Amino acid sequence: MKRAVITGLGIVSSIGNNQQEVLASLREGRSGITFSQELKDSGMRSHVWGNVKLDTTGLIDRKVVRFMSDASIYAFLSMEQAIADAGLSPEAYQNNPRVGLIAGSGGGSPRFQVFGADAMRGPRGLKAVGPYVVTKAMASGVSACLATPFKIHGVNYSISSACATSAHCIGNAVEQIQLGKQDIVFAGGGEELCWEMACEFDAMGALSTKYNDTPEKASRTYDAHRDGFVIAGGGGMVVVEELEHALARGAHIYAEIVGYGATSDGADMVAPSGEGAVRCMKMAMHGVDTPIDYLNSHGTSTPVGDVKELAAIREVFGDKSPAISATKAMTGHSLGAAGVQEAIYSLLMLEHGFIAPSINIEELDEQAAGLNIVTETTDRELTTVMSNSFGFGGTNATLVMRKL
Amino acid sequence: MKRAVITGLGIVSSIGNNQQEVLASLREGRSGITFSQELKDSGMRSHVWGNVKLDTTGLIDRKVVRFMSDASIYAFLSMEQAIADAGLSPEAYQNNPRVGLIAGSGGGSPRFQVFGADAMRGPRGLKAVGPYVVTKAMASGVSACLATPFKIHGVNYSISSACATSAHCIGNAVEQIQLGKQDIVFAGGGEELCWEMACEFDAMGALSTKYNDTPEKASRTYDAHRDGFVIAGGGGMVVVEELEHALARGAHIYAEIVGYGATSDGADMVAPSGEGAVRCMKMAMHGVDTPIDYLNSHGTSTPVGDVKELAAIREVFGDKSPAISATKAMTGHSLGAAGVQEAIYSLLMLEHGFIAPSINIEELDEQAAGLNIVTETTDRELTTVMSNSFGFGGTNATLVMRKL
């Protein structure tokens, strides 16, 4: 069947506003985590976040931006970058039934939902709400707000699956290529960063609270004293393209997507089962005839989650486990954006031949022993990389990407 | 290529709490629309809705329902119905990697997004928010809250695309069967009904406001004096199953899904383009060697939307219009749940051999001439039926279903 490759990428993240900045951060092991007065003022216990350090004012046409929440803004900027990176002209990708968009968010916009409800409850009612809240607050905001301005004619929808959202978007893009239905699908996602949503995670005890005085040290996947994830926002987009189409136009090809796993735990709402993750990784590796050289773990800095994933990795790989690092120790957890951003970090590692460090491991967890968790930037000629995304609701995605 | 059939259905709708009540309403042309004191009290101009008339107290086990918003409640009940209808024992569908779930909502839970933020701002902060808000409020709530208790091991995620949400869910389930990845996928959706979300639509002028004194007349697709849609809630689920698998287990088969179109307008953010709909219908009809006997239109009762769709229908079918009716005139617009509910209405018409009326057309729109809009319940042997879902943000889905 038809083969899918990645021919362009774009990213707005806590560790950089484009792939050059991101690459520099990854090589330097630089944290994107800062203290948040907003989170503290809200009454949360977690006062740290992976914020986007970019003034987005004026970067998007008013007729376009008026419909957007922050998740859409970040995804739109990421898409602009990916189109430039891929070398695609509007003549080629616009008004083209074979060009689609699959991009989502984990939460939509709790900020604008709450804005709408607060405004409605005041003296001015509907007039205070205004006419733009639906496209800001609806679950499909990221796809809707981008398909119009980019003149997309093919598929147009959002997948959501919490922490796995943008990984399933990429996988679904691969399926569209495999089915012969699309030549190009822009795939990715975005997530806003706001107390309105973050407080929901703090309320379930999911966020780091013990390291607020040292924000760069809060996200610490695999460290014995990890205490929850650090919430983040941002966006990413990749250009998923059918192989012959890419070759015909002289595309720059980063990698082929040679595996896509998607499974379900059918067990616990918020904790991973392990069994689902093993099936997901094995599914992504089926027929892949090369070893995994580097695995970018889901690894959110949670007591239970981090080691559940490691146990699954041991079962999958037996006595030949890959180099591993958890880039969330640098970036935080961008929820709906995490899958595509982490696919991008993995692609940059593949393209530039290095492994980004798993930072903040002062004492390695006993359940991580004997694995090559890479803690210093390492130059290495990679060929095949794997990235895991294991979301709330027992939803699992794994992507395997390989040089062509 | 593998073929996909529907072997079970389940529904909680403004017109009935199961398929027997729905069939009776469809045949009778009975409105599901009532006056809402909730909407009026909130300060809205629209005071009518398509509510679910069912006390859900104690229908779902405490430990399962604690994670759920109303969208998930409705989808869950619909799934129970669909499972019984398909004759699937727990052993048949649970803990089975070949069995998946793709189900979504258009809005997630605005009610619980707002609840979280309100709770956080009160005297108990995180303790008032509690540990269940993420699963209620996140965009993937419907898939997450069902995959766990039904012990689903295959695919597990939500698609969101506004009014097209659960139609794309069904189409993606078909794709999973076509790719040979799953033998059964439960597909569908749910939507809560609440002022928190409804007020956003009223604020953009989308909802009917002139008929609050006569709620049953408010939703009036194709009528010259239509003035916007009537918001609704509910759920639906269908069992999408690979053909040979269905036959081998002695399943009852309603219909084969013989076409699925998904396209994008890429045009004006606010209005349907018309051309996107044409492309979607044509995609769904590709290779289907029988005429479309009946078309369940998207038709929401909006001045612009209704006639845009009629124009697209004329372009596709010329002078050989199918029988058409807009069931939203009875049911209102259940947003994320509309695609699966309307596929179910269409399947019931196909199974029982009748065409449900397009009600409330007192004066046919000056731009609706030369088509067959059916306004009275009509018994007729049907073979091939089509259902359109054209979502906000220019996202289109069409399903074509045919007797085996």
Side-chain angles (χ1 to χ4, degrees), chain A residues 1-62 64-209 211-216 218-318 321-404, chain B residues 1-61 64-126 128-216 218-307 309-361 363-365 367-375 377-380 382-404:
Chain A
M1 74 193 156
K2 299 164 187 310
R3 292 166 70 187
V5 294
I6 299 191
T7 59
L9 58 86
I11 186 163
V12 175
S13 145
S14 65
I15 61 163
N17 297 320
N18 57 44
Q19 66 160 289
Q20 288 77 201
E21 298 186 358
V22 166
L23 176 58
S25 290
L26 288 175
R27 286 191 178 139
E28 292 174 37
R30 162 175 39 268
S31 174
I33 302 314
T34 58
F35 170 79
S36 177
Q37 194 69 48
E38 175 178 324
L39 295 191
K40 188 180 183 197
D41 288 352
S42 80
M44 286 175 54
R45 299 174 297 193
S46 184
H47 310 163
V48 293
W49 63 8
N51 61 315
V52 170
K53 300 139 189 97
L54 177 67
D55 191 344
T56 58
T57 301
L59 298 185
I60 305 173
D61 290 342
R62 177 52 186 179
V64 179
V65 80
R66 62 186 174 156
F67 297 109
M68 297 179 161
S69 65
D70 286 344
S72 294
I73 292 170
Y74 299 148
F76 178 98
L77 294 172
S78 294
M79 185 157 166
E80 284 198 316
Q81 288 177 32
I83 288 167
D85 189 44
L88 290 165
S89 69
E91 289 85 345
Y93 79 84
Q94 293 185 358
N95 278 226
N96 183 340
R98 312 251 331 140
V99 173
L101 164 69
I102 301 172
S105 59
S109 184
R111 172 149 294 160
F112 280 97
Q113 188 49 57
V114 172
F115 163 79
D118 286 357
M120 186 69 195
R121 286 177 296 184
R124 291 186 53 71
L126 295 171
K127 301 179 306 299
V129 180
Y132 297 115
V133 184
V134 182
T135 52
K136 299 188 179 175
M138 71 189 188
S140 59
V142 168
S143 56
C145 287
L146 270 57
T148 286
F150 290 110
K151 301 188 171 299
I152 301 301
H153 277 195
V155 299
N156 161 20
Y157 48 70
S158 296
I159 292 164
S160 195
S161 50
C163 324
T165 292
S166 48
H168 289 297
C169 289
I170 289 167
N172 275 249
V174 172
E175 292 172 341
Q176 289 302 300
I177 278 70
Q178 293 177 333
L179 288 161
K181 292 184 178 189
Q182 306 280 258
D183 292 331
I184 291 172
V185 177
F186 295 101
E191 203 77 57
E192 74 185 24
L193 186 49
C194 61
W195 70 266
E196 290 91 324
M197 183 170 57
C199 76
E200 303 174 5
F201 291 92
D202 201 353
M204 54 169 298
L207 302 186
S208 177
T209 69
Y211 299 98
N212 295 325
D213 295 331
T214 57
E216 290 187 7
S219 197
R220 58 203 289 134
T221 313
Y222 310 125
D223 176 81
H225 303 99
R226 68 192 178 277
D227 78 321
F229 76 85
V230 172
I231 197 163
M237 199 68 61
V238 293
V239 184
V240 182
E241 192 167 352
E242 186 273 325
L243 180 58
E244 296 307 320
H245 191 273
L247 290 174
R249 73 181 183 83
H252 180 258
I253 295 167
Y254 289 93
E256 183 184 1
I257 305 167
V258 298
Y260 164 44
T263 69
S264 175
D265 289 358
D268 192 78
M269 276 313 270
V270 277
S273 76
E275 189 270 344
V278 170
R279 283 189 291 110
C280 192
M281 285 183 279
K282 286 183 185 173
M283 185 181 300
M285 287 300 294
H286 193 80
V288 172
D289 68 0
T290 48
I292 300 303
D293 296 314
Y294 167 69
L295 188 162
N296 183 274
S297 58
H298 171 64
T300 65
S301 204
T302 289
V304 175
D306 287 7
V307 296
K308 278 305 287 176
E309 176 177 19
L310 290 189
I313 286 161
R314 294 186 198 270
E315 181 171 336
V316 170
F317 292 94
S321 54
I324 295 157
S325 70
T327 50
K328 290 185 178 71
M330 286 180 274
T331 65
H333 189 355
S334 59
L335 302 175
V340 58
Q341 293 182 326
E342 290 163 6
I344 291 168
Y345 307 147
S346 298
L347 290 164
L348 288 174
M349 286 184 239
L350 185 60
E351 179 84 340
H352 296 276
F354 76 103
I355 294 158
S358 218
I359 70 164
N360 296 325
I361 304 170
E362 289 179 295
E363 182 186 327
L364 193 65
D365 195 285
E366 61 188 276
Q367 292 197 56
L371 294 179
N372 181 20
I373 307 284
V374 171
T375 54
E376 299 80 49
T377 306
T378 300
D379 286 324
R380 187 168 293 182
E381 195 186 285
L382 307 171
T383 303
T384 310
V385 301
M386 171 177 279
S387 179
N388 286 337
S389 310
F390 302 140
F392 283 179
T395 180
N396 305 309
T398 296
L399 292 168
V400 180
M401 292 174 305
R402 187 166 70 187
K403 276 171 178 300
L404 196 58
Chain B
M1 182 162 59
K2 299 293 184 175
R3 298 163 66 189
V5 297
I6 304 292
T7 58
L9 61 81
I11 184 165
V12 176
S13 166
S14 59
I15 62 157
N17 298 316
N18 56 49
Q19 66 160 288
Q20 291 77 213
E21 293 185 355
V22 165
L23 170 65
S25 294
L26 288 172
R27 285 184 163 142
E28 282 136 60
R30 171 168 41 269
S31 177
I33 308 304
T34 59
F35 172 78
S36 174
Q37 191 68 47
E38 174 177 332
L39 300 190
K40 186 171 178 193
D41 287 346
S42 83
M44 285 173 58
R45 293 171 305 184
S46 184
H47 314 154
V48 296
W49 63 9
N51 59 320
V52 167
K53 300 149 190 73
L54 179 69
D55 180 358
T56 56
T57 304
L59 295 184
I60 308 176
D61 285 8
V64 173
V65 80
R66 66 195 175 160
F67 295 101
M68 293 182 162
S69 64
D70 283 349
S72 287
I73 295 178
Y74 300 148
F76 179 100
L77 298 168
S78 293
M79 185 153 167
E80 285 187 316
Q81 287 176 36
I83 285 162
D85 193 43
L88 290 165
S89 65
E91 296 76 17
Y93 74 88
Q94 302 181 355
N95 305 310
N96 186 340
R98 301 285 302 169
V99 174
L101 184 280
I102 300 170
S105 183
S109 184
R111 169 152 293 165
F112 283 96
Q113 292 172 260
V114 171
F115 171 77
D118 284 354
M120 189 63 209
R121 288 179 292 184
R124 302 181 71 208
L126 298 170
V129 178
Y132 304 118
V133 180
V134 184
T135 57
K136 297 182 183 179
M138 71 190 180
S140 64
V142 171
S143 55
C145 290
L146 274 56
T148 284
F150 287 109
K151 312 300 169 200
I152 300 294
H153 278 192
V155 298
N156 166 14
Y157 50 72
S158 291
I159 299 178
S160 196
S161 48
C163 330
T165 294
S166 52
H168 293 296
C169 287
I170 292 170
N172 274 244
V174 172
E175 290 172 334
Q176 290 303 299
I177 279 163
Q178 292 177 331
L179 288 165
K181 292 185 177 185
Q182 304 277 257
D183 295 324
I184 295 168
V185 179
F186 295 96
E191 200 79 53
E192 70 184 27
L193 185 49
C194 59
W195 72 266
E196 290 91 327
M197 181 163 65
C199 78
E200 298 173 5
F201 291 95
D202 202 357
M204 61 170 289
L207 304 185
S208 177
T209 68
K210 281 167 180 177
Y211 300 97
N212 296 325
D213 292 340
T214 56
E216 297 199 353
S219 187
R220 57 202 285 125
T221 311
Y222 309 135
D223 182 80
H225 296 95
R226 64 198 182 268
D227 72 325
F229 75 87
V230 171
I231 196 161
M237 196 69 69
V238 297
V239 184
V240 184
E241 187 167 358
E242 187 274 325
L243 176 59
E244 294 169 2
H245 188 276
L247 292 166
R249 73 173 187 91
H252 173 259
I253 298 168
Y254 287 92
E256 182 176 2
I257 303 164
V258 293
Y260 164 42
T263 72
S264 174
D265 288 355
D268 191 311
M269 187 70 171
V270 300
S273 77
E275 192 200 310
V278 170
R279 285 186 275 112
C280 194
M281 282 183 277
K282 290 194 184 180
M283 183 177 298
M285 290 164 66
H286 182 76
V288 172
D289 70 357
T290 52
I292 305 308
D293 303 312
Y294 167 75
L295 185 149
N296 187 269
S297 55
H298 164 71
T300 62
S301 202
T302 310
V304 178
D306 285 13
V307 291
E309 175 174 31
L310 289 184
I313 291 168
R314 198 55 179 249
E315 176 55 38
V316 172
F317 291 102
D319 288 317
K320 284 170 179 65
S321 163
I324 302 163
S325 64
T327 48
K328 285 190 181 72
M330 287 180 276
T331 64
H333 189 357
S334 64
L335 305 175
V340 62
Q341 289 178 333
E342 290 164 5
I344 288 170
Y345 306 148
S346 300
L347 289 167
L348 289 169
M349 287 182 238
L350 181 64
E351 180 82 348
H352 297 279
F354 74 102
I355 296 160
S358 214
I359 72 160
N360 288 332
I361 304 175
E363 181 182 321
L364 211 239
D365 191 279
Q367 289 289 298
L371 293 169
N372 189 19
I373 302 286
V374 172
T375 65
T377 306
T378 303
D379 286 330
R380 186 165 291 163
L382 307 173
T383 299
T384 311
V385 303
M386 191 166 82
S387 174
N388 287 339
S389 311
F390 303 142
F392 203 39
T395 178
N396 309 304
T398 294
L399 293 169
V400 176
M401 308 145 269
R402 187 167 70 181
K403 285 178 169 300
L404 260 186

